[PDB]
């Protein structure tokens, strides 16, 4: 039992490396960010280009949606985040305070807060309404590669090149858990909150419960980039990630076997995303490629 993702659409238009793609929670849209300093919005089901959003002064490493699908936040080498009204394309707020590139970002499920991680080694928590920084966590001793909230916003998980994954109490700022030593290049909670998936730059993904690793997925290449990984849960239960051999890998969540590889890109697949209700994967690639692809499966 394996999925049968097949290519349906190629979303071309960025003019440099794509950095991150995300489906909107309502399923209607895909947002992408790129080194070309733009964000683009695309139809999730037919890949139709919808709009270009502009204003960052340097390349963008991440983008993320608010719960209601009405706002985006982006993280840029310009040391700022920006909050966007996706209807109008306008920048509502510029979040200033990091002292080096902002690398990763996310809303909480309430979407009154944004969390960011930076090459400055900190995690910052921001008020969406005022754009003010509410907390700066001295979270890591090297760049922060990922930050994500759990399902009720009560926890944040962060990962870093310093080899640590840390779970934080949002409200108190306290570190509740620290999860060898390879750089941790990506982390996220599962769609239900109960697990975390972490990538390390030794070509390994791990599913963690107790502070214990329950599964390890390997076979792909990941020694250089902060590649997004995902749980796919609309059909069969898979783990999905890009890879530095230019493929999308899909693994069986429970058996850990590779069940499909998707071939379309001519550079590192930096980012993948899984649609919230249909079996659709978006993939995006770096400078030699510059495209996003939409793939669909019957399971």
């Amino acid at each position: 039992v394996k999925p049968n993702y097949a290519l349906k659409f190629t979303l071309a238009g960025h003019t440099k490396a794509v950095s991150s793609v995300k489906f909107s929670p309502n399923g209607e849209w895909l947002a992408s960010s790129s080194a070309d300093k733009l964000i683009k919005i695309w139809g999730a089901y037919d890949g139709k280009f919808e709009k270009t959003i502009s204003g960052h002064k340097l390349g963008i490493s991440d983008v993320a949606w608010s719960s209601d699908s009405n706002l985006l936040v982006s993280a840029s080498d310009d040391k700022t985040l920006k909050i966007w009204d996706v209807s109008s394309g306008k920048c509502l707020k510029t979040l200033k305070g990091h002292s080096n590139y902002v690398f990763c970002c996310n809303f909480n499920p309430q979407s009154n807060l944004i969390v960011s991680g930076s090459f400055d080694e900190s995690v910052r928590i921001w008020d969406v309404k005022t754009g003010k920084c509410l907390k700066t966590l001295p979270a890591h001793s090297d760049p922060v590669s990922a930050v994500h909230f759990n399902r009720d916003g009560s926890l944040i998980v962060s990962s870093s090149y310093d080899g640590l994954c840390r779970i934080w109490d949002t409200a108190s700022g306290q570190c509740l858990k620290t999860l060898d030593n390879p750089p941790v290049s990506f982390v996220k909670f599962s769609p239900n909150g109960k697990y975390i998936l972490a990538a390390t730059l030794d070509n390994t993904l791990k599913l963690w419960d107790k502070g214990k690793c329950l599964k390890t997925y390997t076979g792909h290449k990941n020694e250089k980039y902060c590649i997004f990984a995902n749980f796919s849960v609309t059909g069969g239960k898979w783990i999905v990630s890009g890879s530095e051999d230019n493929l999308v890998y899909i693994w069986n969540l429970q058996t850990k076997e590779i069940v499909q590889k998707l071939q379309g890109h001519t550079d590192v697949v930096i980012s993948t995303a899984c649609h919230p209700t249909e079996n659709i994967i978006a993939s995006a690639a770096l400078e030699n490629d510059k495209t996003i692809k939409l793939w669909k499966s019957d399971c």
Partner: peptide, 11 residues
């Protein structure tokens, strides 16, 4: 040009 699209050099 962004941080995500530049490699973390190991060795």
């Amino acid at each position: 040009g962004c941080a995500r699209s530049e490699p973390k050099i190991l060795t």
